[PDB]
C-alpha cells in the first residue's frame, strides 16, 4: 500500500472545479429559465462576448499544453495544465453566462449556456482522458483520443462565440 501518485493529481483535482462548473451552471440554467440570472449591465456585452473570445483562446491554448507530450506516471505540466484549462472554463462560463443575463430574448440566453455547458462536457472528458494517459508512460490509444476531445472543446468555443447574439 501507500502509493506516492500525489504528484499528478491536479488532473483530478482540476476535474472537480469542472464538476462544479456544469453544476454551477446547472442553478444558472433553471435560474435563467425562470428569469433570475444577473441583468446588472454594469458590463455591456460587447465586453462579454470580448472576454469569451480571450477565454475561449485562452483555454484553446491551456489544452495545447495537455496535448503536449505525454505524464508518465508523474508530471507537473500536465497538472499546470489541468489547473489552466479550468480557469479558462470559469472564465468562458462566467462571461456566457453574463451575455445571457444581458439579453432580454428567452431563446439565445439557453443557447449561449449551452454551448458553454457542451465546451466543459467536452472538457470534462478531455481530463478524465488525460488523467487515465497520466497512468500511462506514453499510451498511443489515450492520446489519440485526447486529441479528439481536446479538439470537440474547441469546437464547442468556437460554436459558443458563434452562438452569441449579433444580430444587428
Known sequence: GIDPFTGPLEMDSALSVVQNLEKDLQEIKAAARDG?????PGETMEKCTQDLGNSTKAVSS???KLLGEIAQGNENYA???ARDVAGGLRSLAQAARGVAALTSDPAVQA???DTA???LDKASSLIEEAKKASGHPGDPESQQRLAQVAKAVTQAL???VSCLPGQR
Open 158 to 160: 468556437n460554436r459558443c
Open 62 to 64: 491551456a489544452i495545447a
Open 111 to 113: 443557447i449561449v449556456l
Open 36 to 40: 433570475k440570472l444577473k441583468p446588472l
Open 117 to 119: 455547458s457542451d465546451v
Open 79 to 81: 497538472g499546470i495544465a
